[model samples]
Target: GEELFTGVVPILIELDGHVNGHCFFVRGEGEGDATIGKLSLKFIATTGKLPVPWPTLVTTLVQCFSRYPDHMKRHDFFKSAMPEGYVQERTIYFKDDGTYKTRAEVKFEGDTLVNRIELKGIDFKEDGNILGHKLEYNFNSHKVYITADKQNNGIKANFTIRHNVEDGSVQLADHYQQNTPIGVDLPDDHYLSTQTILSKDLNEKRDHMVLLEYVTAA
Candidate 1:
């Protein structure tokens, strides 16, 4: 089963005092694991009240969603099937020849996710396997936020981007987003438990890991 894909990846954050990195051993099965990957960083808010920018935080995360052969393959898959829009509105900008630039915006209308991205100056890269656009987003523990648990949930995501036609690339501008975790707690029989092991620090080598369950939610 895909449960075998459960694993961790190294996340380097240059905050706190000096340059540092932390490994978050993301675990679970199927898309549930992917959802977990999406919510892990949210566990630690980026700031005091504001949640972390999902657009920037997703830099390494979107990789978890794809079962590709390598990073390049994964990115390629994402760029092709990137989400069309979001329920909320967002604006993105990128650096042009001189100053930064505005890209796209998504306005919410009921549950219909809607947004568009300019693929000009945006740096979209695909190493054959994975595809991703270079972005200038900040991941602050204080700005991160989460509202879902273990029962059921639906994710509301959005991103804004600038387009660079000359080089066939897209530059990430700004973004706004949110996610709703329907379940407050996992089933009693569920094997996995969400817990924080290390204090806020990048020097942390290995990430904490616990037994995972629910390989697939079908």
Candidate 2:
């Protein structure tokens, strides 16, 4: 018998001063006692009601990522992988020359540090991993609608991203257009959630789905 822990990490928004709309939904698992090195994480984006632009969305993405490793270090809300007092120092290499680095060695913001998460092969089609290409899609239900324009519609990008959680790599792990509208409440137990265009291997796992009620300011 072994221990397995999993949870959903929502990249929420501070809309003008209130929490509204989820930008990304990250789901994954942690090994025994939530070990740092064997952590496996996956991601997807949908902007509930935010008409954010591409560049700004990238900012949101990289920023949320900066803290993810820290979140992963802990098994749940009340446990961690690091010991009593220490600081793990390293750099998270984001594509397009933007880097997230920490140098507080031998310290504790609560001790230890996140390993790394990379966007090396998102294939954004613009700056590769920076300006994800705009997509033309709408949800089938829940009345979610994306802004008609392509410039600032953060929910309409088409691309595939991989998460480098510790040393394991799942290419097209995030596998997005990180598709689906930027809205909706995904079920809590979606390990093999339905993917609209999932890769071949796991297409046989479950019936992939999005977790959106997209719409304009309508």
Candidate 3:
């Protein structure tokens, strides 16, 4: 099963950088049938001003966005976004046990003054992507839908963007998972089925997979 099992899984990422693109694979003890639970992804664009390398983008997104309201700065993420009738806020925290937790809070602006949203799970990677989790919060609909696909030892997920006018919608796209030893279990069999309701932009989005391998000495 070694040949057909554990090995390498390829992930290509396209964002902002020197025509940035790379391929990574899956590795570790849980190489076979790795259980991928819920995770979170924070996206940061090269368009913003920051003082960090590319690998630490996820944490930056968290730090920058979380502090937006507190700072009262000129450029606030939620400041320009559509106001939701029913809002859902999420927060993520990683524990010492290597498992992350996601806390989600929901309430109406009129009914409640403030609500806290938490998302805990894997550590946020540079691309604002989670290693093994996904969290969904619907502000307008006032609901949360969390899904997990842990069929493989190696699993991956990413977020894609579909833009529109003032009333457009954003949806996650391109989710992949595999079940096997390691690299052999790449993902393939999930995508959005219907057309987006709001007239807007469509694009392919998913997790940027990166795998690095090297020989070590004992």
lDDT tens per residue, model 3, 1-218: 11111122111112322111222221111111101111122232324432222222221111111122222322221112212211222222322112223222222234221223232334334333223222221111111111223553322323222211123433232212111121122223222111111111135242231212111101
**TM, every model:** 0.20, 0.21, 0.18
Model 1's TM-score against the true structure: 0.20
lDDT of 2 by residue, 79-138 (tens): 221222122222333444233323221111232222222222222333322232222221
Over the stretch 69-150, how does candidate 1's per-residue lDDT look in tens digits?
3322322212122233222212223333211122333322242222322211223223210123232232212111222233
Best by lDDT: 1
- In terms of TM-score, which candidate is stronger, 1 or 3? 1
In candidate 3, position 45 carries an lDDT of 34
Error of 2 at 196 (Å): 24
